[PDB]
Design a protein around this ligand. Structure first.
Ligand SMILES: CCCCCCCCCCCCCCCCCC(=O)OC[C@H](COP(=O)([O-])OCC(O)COP(=O)([O-])OC[C@@H](COC(=O)CCCCCCCCCCCCCCCCC)OC(=O)CCCCCCCCCCCCCCCCC)OC(=O)CCCCCCCCCCCCCCCCC
Ligand SMILES: CCCCCCCCCCCCCCCCCC(=O)OC[C@H](COP(=O)(O)OCCN)OC(=O)CCCCCCCCCCCCCCCCC
Ligand SMILES: CCCCCCCCCCCCCCCCCC(=O)OC[C@H](COP(=O)(O)OCCN)OC(=O)CCCCCCCCCCCCCCCCC
Ligand SMILES: CCCCCCCCCCCCO[C@@H]1O[C@H](CO)[C@@H](O[C@H]2O[C@H](CO)[C@@H](O)[C@H](O)[C@H]2O)[C@H](O)[C@H]1O
Ligand SMILES: CCCCCCCCCCCCO[C@@H]1O[C@H](CO)[C@@H](O[C@H]2O[C@H](CO)[C@@H](O)[C@H](O)[C@H]2O)[C@H](O)[C@H]1O
Lengths: 200, 50, 79, 170, 171, 103, 12, 101, 155, 113, 67, 121, 84
């Protein structure tokens, strides 16, 4: 539970570094491994003959990526510790450092190395207005700024009731709650269970 | 990633089918938004990354 | 077998637990568990970075290594 | 190795190396290592085995089946003639399955060989595949699991009757 | 089954844990945990049990409205992430009876001491049964409580499966 | 609320037995009584030999003399040919392209 | 310190 | 062709060897996890040679090495596709699995 | 087990109900059979339709994984109510409201996707132009049949 | 606070059950009688479970009664679904057979069946 | 073990984990700055985007209203 | 999407239709219009095994780039200039499509401006 | 690796940080109500403090019985299989 983490930025310096690099790569920080795919993908979608709603939903999801990436870093690494009193924090195993280290090097350079070696199989689109070229970087930045505002408001001495949008997000839209009870119930009672025609 | 890889294998067919392109476009768009919305309030670190 | 630190060093003064105690005193209440939380705001846990400070970890030497690289690249090519 | 006419290939056209860099090609040196450490010892082992095979050389043959009268020449219920005609029809049915497999293998090899130009360059293989499939379908398709020469003939005569009627109306 | 006092205390613990899941930060939790304690102390001396029951009933509806939809759970508590994680490694002690003699030969000292426990169990059993028999009212027990051993040299009735249960981290 | 005196006694007697049992789960010193850089380069040398060299010998022999002797078992995409290339097999010279306008 | 691990018989 | 095809298959065969050794009791249980991790790392190395060959000239091939079953006019062979997608994905999967192991 | 300890036919009289309740280790005021019909429940108790996940997890059950005690009557549909299957636990949001919000979300998304399909985004460009009669031969056009010319002009 | 609406798959919490707080004395008596039955069965089980000399299975009549009742008695079960699927498949296959006869169903490469 | 747990206190750290962590954080920022210096067009735009309103009627072949 | 607001919210009759463009004759308004020149022959693109979608009017630069890459291996940072030349050609090709859309748009507005007056008379 | 003395020290450490208890009168056998004068609401907070300290839950049925430090130490040792 991230609510029982906190204050790990210095206690786990190497895990911290890998966590920050991975979060920046995931959010499409320029020239990290994630940028060499996502950045081209958002430009390809922006400039295609495409469903307009699907395009908008994809950009909002890109913004939301910055938010839950921030949420991990803020609650896991920043602030004061919220874990129990007996501190057994230790990341100094060579198998742990070396395994993460290789993936860290991959997360910095793999996209660049792969991008420049694969042969082109399409005509990449490179002409577009400035607001379609930088859309991914902007909405990602906006998602980070908003994520900070939301996270820092958790410190204020104000207690809030839950909204309906908050409960929807927390319980995953109720899809598991509704479907994983109803559908098993129907099938399982299907067999272990009146028509006069059959009675004859 | 096997699901995506399956469709990549068959791009020579899907690239000539606008109908399938539209279906996978909308299916992916609702998936990317809906699951990113769910991650905004998860507290388990593994479920967030999931 | 294990020596716990002396318990008398855990004090809420100088910590955001002091701020909570002032607000509670305004309503006549008092917090009897404050010293049990005090270790989380003291010692090596006292000053954590901000989010922007966390993202900028390593930027200082990354920049210094960068400035050298592009100064070196100028000299290599200028000649 | 195999009959090049039954399984044709075009003449290979490799381009000669045309380097435009000073760096050594790691593939070139790996090829030398593979030839020395892998191919050479492997070849020696095979050459030893080939010597033993030469000392003991013996043959096997491809069975030749005499043609026998087919089901059209069999009197009704004359089982002795129907049996020989029926066994022959089954043998040809298994041969036609393999003829279609040969043509399908030509089509598949062409598609891989021609790369991104396969739609244009594999037309002849595609057309030949289309024809043999059509002929195979006419002969054998829809006969059912209990197929026989009799049912194959009944299907052909039905097709011939529809073809005669269509020309008659034409 | 639960008394009014027990129901109040269970709500107080439950509300604090859900309050803690909302606040997250310790200073924020400490502040609001004190306000919540104050509300419970506002009616600690209510003597009218009809009013006291209504206060409890209304507090439960208030809790249901304001509970965290995803409250913190200790990892090994029911519904936690580590709950039942080590059940696959827990093996009952009677399996050692079926070990081949060659396997038993690798731990001669452990199996010597094991025989002393089996002997202790055998020689205690008749007393345990007879103690329960003479302490049980005619119509069988009315509760699941078990008695302690009364004499010296006696073991409390029905002790074997409690004393020899698998360790919580058995491997 | 709190343990009754009979509850305290039963808990005490079980904890004493339970702690004695847990102590007896400790192995004695003799248990279990079992029946009867240059290093690094050698370990990785023997591993490469038995797990890379030997299998590649088998696979190459299998491919060279059993798989590639049958039609269409291994099919390469034919090499790309570009203007100005020389074909090894025939010595053919592929002509260059027309003149590019300008840009 | 080493503790005995209770396992089902593996001999058979 | 012979180096490319041979090394494409050793990569896959190399990964099945720790499974063979376990299922036939002929390995050292002391550090089977190290043995498995070493096999992955060597498979990554051998897989980078076919990938390099593809990056160089776009060399692609299909290996249909074993005729398993023929159902009338459907012939089923064990067939491996060493193409753009296989050449690029396998080293990435092996490199990442090497870290995870 | 004997024959008087096994399930029997639906209980007719109060005396049979008392006997049935005793056979099932139930208190007679708690015993209630399924309504008589053709299903074939007999005198088996009708127990509350609740999941085993709802039982107290800290109590010392004889079967902790099932949360059952030895001898207690098993729900008719227990195999459906094991902790691996159907859950009837209370939920922080009312069932009917959960259905409205879930259905509403999916219904809204489907509508908007259809709207987005009817008003697609695109850039202000003309069709991409290809040479050689729109690549007639490369796309597998019949070499012998003549394609209509496709002429593209500069601009 | 909007009231809790129980459902078949979402039951009413005990803390919101009005019967949970309005305990009488004949409800206490019923609770005491339920615990007596549970305790009586707990003792019976434990006297066998703890017996050092027992090796086997403690037969549970409740489990035998459950399986016995569940195995007795040997629209989705009658002719309804069979008729529905018959008309679905008969209709589909009639349409297909008509197209094949008119030469309007594409079977260009269909030679496996 | 090599690291000993502490009660209510910041944990003990090694020099190696801190130095390596700082090295790879600095490497990340060097790589970003270096790439942005050389490939800023990958981020901001490769080619100018024309203003179609500035194209003349002569170069688009738009005849006058009287034709 | 600026043009999208005009078409979906304003008058669609004077906006181009991307699925049916062009609707005016190519030479209309152009006295003497040149054809588009293709540098690479069909055989050259066939032997180079270019992807069909790449066999456009810029294919000669792609062929030059693809040859450079094969020759410069293992130096995967080479051929930057060849890549830019192909990229810049594709940008010029795209700008021409932008001009076609604008030409279609201005011809449609010219059509309306005619129809108004003739309507007025 | 918890030890009996280790559990005892941490249990008493938490109580010495509770402002409602005089740290000099406290002992392993002090009764929270009959010696230290606390009430049942205070005892609930103490159990929650112990749950936080050792990182596991004590169910309300068991928790309400733990009325002195020794009983808490004994409860924790039994749950963690601490015998020395
Ligand atoms: C000549 C004629 C030849 C005769 C046949 C020769 C082969 C028979 C070999 C018998 C000897 C095997 C042996 O001694 O090793 C015992 C071997 C190792 O013993 P162990 O280390 O003590 O492990 C104990 C457990 O049995 C170990 O169990 P486990 O839990 O570790 O796993 C065992 C494994 C069962 O073994 C594998 O199936 O089960 C699985 O892992 C399930 C995986 C399912 C496969 C999923 C992938 C399907 C795709 C298949 C791709 C096929 C290629 C195309 O254990 C066994 O596997 C016993 C079952 C043998 C089944 C073989 C099939
Ligand atoms: C759609 C496909 C799905 C498949 C599903 C079935 C999965 C089963 C599990 C797969 C196991 C891997 C099988 C592939 C390994 C090679 C097997 C093999 O070599 O088979 C014998 C081979 C048969 O040759 P072939 O004509 O292609 O087939 C005959 C028709 N059945 O005979 C030969 O070619 C000659 C081999 C000579 C070997 C010489 C080198 C041996 C060196 C010693 C090794 C020890
Ligand atoms: C784009 C288009 C999208 C297409 C969507 C159509 C399919 C959507 C519905 C899928 C099936 C939904 C039921 C899934 C049930 C399930 O996932 O099992 C989980 C269930 C409880 O699991 P859980 O909620 O996670 O709780 C864990 C903590 N106790 O545990 C269980 O009880 C399950 C085990 C018992 C099995 C019950 C039978 C399930 C029958 C429904 C599954 C489908 C049956 C075949 C029909 C599907 C094909 C049409
Ligand atoms: C980036 C994603 C953008 C797309 C977001 C799509 C969100 C779509 C949400 C649609 C579902 C809304 O569903 C609606 O919720 C409100 C909230 O109380 C309910 O409102 C109603 O129910 C509640 C509770 O019973 C009562 O107080 C009252 O009757 C009324 O408020 C409606 O009965 C329901 O129809
Ligand atoms: C081609 C070039 C590629 C890029 C190369 C980049 C190489 C850069 C190497 C930098 C190595 C720096 O090494 C690291 O610096 C940081 C500076 O905060 C030190 O950390 C320092 O600050 C923190 C507090 O903020 C404390 O740990 C302490 O005050 C001090 O150690 C580390 O003790 C040291 O291990």
């Amino acid at each position: 539970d991230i609510r029982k983490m906190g204050g790990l930025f210095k206690a786990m310096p190497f895990t911290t570094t890998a966590l920050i690099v991975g979060s920046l790569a995931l959010t499409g920080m320029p020239f990290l491994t994630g940028f060499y795919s996502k950045d081209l993908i958002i430009e390809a979608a922006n400039t295609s003959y495409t469903n307009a709603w699907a395009l908008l939903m994809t950009l909002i999801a890109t913004s939301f990526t910055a938010i839950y990436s921030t949420r991990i870093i803020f609650f896991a690494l920043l602030g004061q510790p919220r874990f129990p009193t007996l501190v057994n924090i230790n990341e100094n195993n060579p198998l742990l450092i070396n395994s993460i280290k290789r993936l860290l090097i991959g997360s910095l350079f793999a996209g660049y190395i792969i991008s420049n070696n694969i042969p082109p199989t399409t005509i990449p689109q490179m002409t577009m207005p400035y607001y379609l070229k930088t859309t991914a970087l902007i909405v990602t930045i906006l998602g980070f700024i908003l994520a900070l505002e939301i996270s820092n408001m958790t410190k204020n001495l104000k207690y809030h009731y839950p909204s309906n949008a908050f409960k929807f997000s927390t319980l995953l839209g109720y899809f598991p709650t509704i479907m994983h009870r109803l559908a098993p119930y129907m099938n399982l009672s299907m067999s272990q269970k009146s028509s006069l025609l059959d009675l004859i | 990633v096997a699901g995506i890889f399956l469709l990549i294998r068959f791009y020579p067919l899907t690239e000539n089918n606008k109908y399938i392109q539209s279906i996978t476009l909308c299916l992916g768009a609702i998936t990317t938004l809906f699951t990113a919305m769910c991650a905004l309030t998860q507290n388990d670190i593994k479920k967030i990354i999931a | 077998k294990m020596e716990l630190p002396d318990y008398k060093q855990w004090k809420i003064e100088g910590t955001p637990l002091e701020t909570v105690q002032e607000k509670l005193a305004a309503r006549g209440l008092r917090d009897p568990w404050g010293r049990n939380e005090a270790w989380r705001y003291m010692g090596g846990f006292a000053n954590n970075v901000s989010f922007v400070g966390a993202l900028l970890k390593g930027f200082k030497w990354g920049f210094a290594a960068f400035v050298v690289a592009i100064g070196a690249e100028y000299y290599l090519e200028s000649q | 190795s195999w009959d090049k006419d039954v399984y044709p290939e075009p003449p290979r056209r490799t381009p000669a190396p045309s380097p435009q860099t000073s760096l050594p090609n790691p593939i070139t040196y790996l090829t030398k290592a593979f030839d020395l450490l892998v191919d050479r010892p492997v070849t020696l082992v095979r050459e030893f085995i080939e010597r033993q095979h030469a000392k003991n050389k013996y043959y096997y043959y491809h069975r030749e089946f005499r043609r026998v009268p087919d089901i059209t020449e069999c009197q009704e219920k004359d089982v002795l003639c129907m049996f020989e005609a029926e066994m022959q029809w089954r043998r040809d049915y298994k041969v036609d399955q393999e003829i279609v497999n040969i043509i399908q293998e030509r089509l598949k090899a062409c598609q891989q060989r021609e790369g991104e130009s396969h739609r244009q360059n594999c037309a002849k293989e595609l057309e030949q595949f289309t024809q043999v499939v059509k002929a195979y379908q006419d002969r054998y398709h829809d006969l059912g699991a209990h197929y026989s020469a009799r049912k194959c003939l009944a299907k052909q005569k039905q097709r011939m009757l529809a073809e005669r009627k269509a020309a008659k109306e034409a | 089954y639960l008394t009014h006092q027990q129901k109040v205390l269970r709500l107080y613990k439950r509300a604090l844990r859900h309050l803690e899941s909302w606040c997250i930060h310790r200073d924020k939790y400490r502040y609001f945990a004190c306000l919540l304690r104050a509300r419970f102390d506002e009616h600690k001396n209510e003597k009218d049990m009809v009013k006291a029951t209504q206060l409890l009933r209304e507090a439960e509806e208030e809790f249901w409205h304001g509970q965290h939809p995803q409250p913190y759970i200790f990892p090994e508590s029911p519904g936690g992430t580590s709950y039942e994680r080590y059940e696959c490694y827990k093996v009952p002690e009677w399996c050692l009876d079926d070990w081949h003699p060659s396997e038993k030969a690798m731990y001669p000292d452990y199996f010597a001491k094991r025989e002393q426990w089996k002997k202790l169990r055998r020689e205690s059993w008749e007393r345990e049964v007879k103690q329960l028999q003479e302490e049980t009212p005619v119509g069988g027990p009315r509760t699941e409580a078990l008695p302690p051993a009364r004499k010296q040299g006696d073991l409390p009735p029905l002790w074997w499966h409690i004393v020899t249960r698998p360790r919580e981290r058995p491997m | 609320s709190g343990y009754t005196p009979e509850e305290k006694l039963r808990l005490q007697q079980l904890r004493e037995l339970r702690r004695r049992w847990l102590k007896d789960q400790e192995l004695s010193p003799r248990e279990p009584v079992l029946p009867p850089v240059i290093y690094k380069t050698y370990r990785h040398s023997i591993f490469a030999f038995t797990h890379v060299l030997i299998p590649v010998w088998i696979i190459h022999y299998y491919l060279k003399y059993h798989v590639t002797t049958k039609p269409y078992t291994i099919v390469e995409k034919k090499p790309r040919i570009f203007p100005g290339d020389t074909i090894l097999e025939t010595g053919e010279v592929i002509p260059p392209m027309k003149e590019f306008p300008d840009q | 310190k080493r503790l005995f691990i209770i396992k089902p018989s593996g001999f058979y | 062709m012979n180096m490319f095809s041979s090394l494409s298959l050793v990569t896959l065969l190399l990964l099945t060897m720790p499974i063979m050794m376990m299922s036939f009791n002929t390995y050292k249980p002391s550090n089977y996890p190290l043995y498995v991790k070493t096999a992955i790392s060597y498979a990554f190395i051998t897989s980078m040679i076919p990938t390099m060959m593809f990056i160089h000239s776009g060399q692609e091939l299909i290996i249909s090495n074993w005729h398993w079953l023929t159902i009338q006019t459907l012939k089923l062979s064990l067939s491996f596709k060493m193409d753009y997608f296989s050449m690029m994905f396998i080293p990435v999967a092996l490199f990442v699995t090497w870290s995870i192991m | 087990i004997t024959k008087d300890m096994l399930p029997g036919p639906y209980p007719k009289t109060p005396e049979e109900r008392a006997a049935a309740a005793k056979k099932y280790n139930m208190r007679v005021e708690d015993y209630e059979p399924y309504p008589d019909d053709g299903t074939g429940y007999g005198d088996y108790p009708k127990l509350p339709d609740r999941s085993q996940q709802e039982r107290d997890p800290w109590y010392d059950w004889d079967h902790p994984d099932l949360r059952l005690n030895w001898g207690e009557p098993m729900h008719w549909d227990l195999d459906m109510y094991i902790r691996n299957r159907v859950d009837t636990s209370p939920t922080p949001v009312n069932w009917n409201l959960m259905c409205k919000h879930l259905f509403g979300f999916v219904a809204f998304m489907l509508f908007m996707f259809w709207v987005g399909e009817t008003y697609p985004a695109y850039q202000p460009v003309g069709p991409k132009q290809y040479p050689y009669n729109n690549l007639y031969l490369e796309r597998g056009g019949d070499p012998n049949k003549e394609p209509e010319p496709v002429v593209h002009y500069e601009i | 606070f909007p009231k809790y609406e129980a459902s078949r798959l979402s039951s009413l919490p005990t803390t919101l059950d009005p019967a949970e707080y309005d305990i009488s004395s004949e409800t206490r008596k019923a609770q005491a009688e339920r615990l007596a039955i549970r305790s009586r069965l707990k003792r019976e089980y434990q006297l066998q479970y703890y017996d050092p000399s027992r090796r086997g299975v403690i037969e549970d009549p409740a489990l035998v009664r459950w399986t016995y009742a569940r195995s007795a008695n040997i629209a989705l079960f009658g002719i309804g679904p069979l008729v529905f699927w018959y008309y679905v498949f008969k209709t589909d296959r009639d349409r297909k057979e008509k197209l094949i006869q008119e030469g309007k169903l594409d079977r260009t490469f269909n030679i496996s069946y | 073990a090599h690291i000993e747990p502490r009660y209510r206190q910041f944990p003990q750290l090694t020099r190696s984990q801190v130095i390596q962590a700082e090295f790879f954080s600095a490497t990340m920022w060097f790589w970003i700055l270096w790439r942005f210096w050389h490939d800023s067009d990958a981020v901001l735009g490769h080619f100018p985007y024309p203003d179609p309103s500035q194209w003349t009627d002569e170069e688009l072949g738009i005849p006058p209203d009287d034709e | 999407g600026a043009h999208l607001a005009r078409r979906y919210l304003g008058d669609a009759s004077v906006e181009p239709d991307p699925l049916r463009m062009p609707t005016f004759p190519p030479d209309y308004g152009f006295p003497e219009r040149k054809e588009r020149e293709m540098v690479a022959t069909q055989q050259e693109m066939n032997d180079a095994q270019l992807v069909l979608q790449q066999r456009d009017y810029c294919a000669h630069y792609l062929i030059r780039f693809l040859k450079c890459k094969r020759d410069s291996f293992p130096n995967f940072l080479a051929c930057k200039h060849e890549r830019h030349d192909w990229d810049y050609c594709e940008h010029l090709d795209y700008v021409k499509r932008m001009k076609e859309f604008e030409r279609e748009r201005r011809l449609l507005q010219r059509k309306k401006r005619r129809e108004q007056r003739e309507a007025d008379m | 690796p918890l030890t009996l003395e280790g559990i005892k020290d941490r249990v008493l450490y938490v109580l010495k940080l509770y402002d409602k208890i005089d740290p000099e009168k406290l002992s392993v056998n002090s009764h929270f109500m009959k010696d230290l004068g606390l009430d049942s609401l205070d005892q609930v907070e103490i159990i929650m403090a112990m749950e936080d300290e050792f990182g596991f839950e004590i169910p309300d049925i068991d928790a309400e019985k733990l009325m002195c430090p020794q009983e808490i130490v004994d409860y924790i040792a039994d749950k963690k299989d601490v015998y020395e």
